Amino acid sequence: GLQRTLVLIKPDAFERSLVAEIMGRIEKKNFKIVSMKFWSKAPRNLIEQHYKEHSEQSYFNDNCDFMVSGPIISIVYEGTDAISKIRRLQGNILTPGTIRGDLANDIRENLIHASDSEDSAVDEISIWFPET
Template identity: 50%
Template sequence: MSQRTLVLLKPDAVRRGLVGEIIGRIESKAGWKISALELRTLDRPLLETHYAEHEGQPFYEPLMTFMSSGPSVAMVVEGERVIEGLRTMAGPTDPIAAAPGSIRGDFGTIVRENLIHASDSEESAEREMKIFFPNFV
């Protein structure tokens, strides 16, 4: 089933020069395509909307500070089972638990700065794409 999802390459991925490597992995997956892409520094109001369900958690403020610390790449990726596939490609949040071959397994260093966000469901993907690309969806 063809789907669309939001992917964010976080400030650590941009800072470390991993954008090309990660996009290359996405583009090399047969049948997947990037249909929207933008490099931008994410402001607090946008991040508050995106991370609303985490407000009040101990990691919320450090996450907000990290995510606004530099540019990120926001993109919409389309393809067969892309939501599940990108979550697998990204690997678990903890880079120690992430398998070699996954983005976090190969390049991750710490849990909080974990390189990539990929929507976890069709509902989340729709909500998140509207936040980052309101004129696209």
């Protein structure tokens, strides 16, 4: 039933004034905020931990540089089937109706991260909320 998932609101959301728009979409599907931190600039080690599965890719450093270019919010959301449901809400830039489908048009500047699995959720929550 109940799950917790990790969401990042990305620097481009701040730049484009879409923070509340994104949070509102998750809130409207009835998911609750369990933990939340605002980072004026997230420490790079946290970002590199978060994206460690990508450490070998050509885009790794550039993506980290983006994620450090402005503020981030890290949020733990709770609700039924939260991991998959918030992943679906995130969507992609090809799918209207979703956060990325309605609001994003870039492979990197895509507004929001949501955990993609039970395993990744557990790990991302411990990165951003280790006092847990």
